[PDB]
Amino acid sequence: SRVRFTTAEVDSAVARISQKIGVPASYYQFLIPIENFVVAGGFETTVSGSFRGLGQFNRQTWDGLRRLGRNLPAFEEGSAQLNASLYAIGFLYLENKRAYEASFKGRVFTHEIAYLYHNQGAPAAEQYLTSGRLVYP
Ligand SMILES: CC(=O)N[C@@H]1[C@@H](O)[C@H](O[C@@H]2O[C@H](CO)[C@@H](O[C@@H]3O[C@H](CO)[C@@H](O[C@@H]4O[C@H](CO)[C@@H](O)[C@H](O)[C@H]4NC(C)=O)[C@H](O)[C@H]3NC(C)=O)[C@H](O)[C@H]2NC(C)=O)[C@@H](CO)O[C@H]1O
């Protein structure tokens, strides 16, 4: 119920995909080790149960991206796949960047904030920020 990926293949795919869709590679570099099992030379990612793949998506959020017109494989296929899982992380980043920039005009959508949105979901993350829960330097 896990898939193992190598550092080399993740780095290559992230470089290609980040370029294609305009999401910084450094965001992936932050998120992937946070969400997955870091092993010598790569990662293991859970592809069974409710939260799957490098992004640790649930089915409702994966399908939510597909509802937007993002071309992704089905949840159970794409989460076990390197490229699709990376596209999904990035597509979600892009939706969240738009949401954040509309809710919080004049502020930067940082990697930290992007991950807060990824992990909590946009409705909860917006409320977390509006309620003053993120500490800033
Ligand atoms: C205990 C704990 O901490 N568990 C963590 C899980 O909560 C976490 O999974 C995340 O769970 C939240 C809550 O269910 C989920 O939130 C959803 O977020 C999406 C994406 O922003 C929202 O869907 C968007 O809604 C807007 C507004 O209607 C739409 O315009 C937009 O098109 C929608 N986009 C998509 C892509 O669907 C949902 O509304 C929101 N749902 C709720 C109930 O709040 C996250 O998406 C979950 N994260 C992921 C990556 O799936 C889990 C994550 O790994 O970690 C646990 O620890």
TrEMBL record:
Please indicate which superkingdom the organism of origin belongs to. Answer: Viruses
Q: What is the protein name stated in its UniProt record? A: Membrane protein
Q: Which organism is it from?
A: Cystovirus phi6
Query: Parent protein range shown?
Result: 61 to 197 of 220
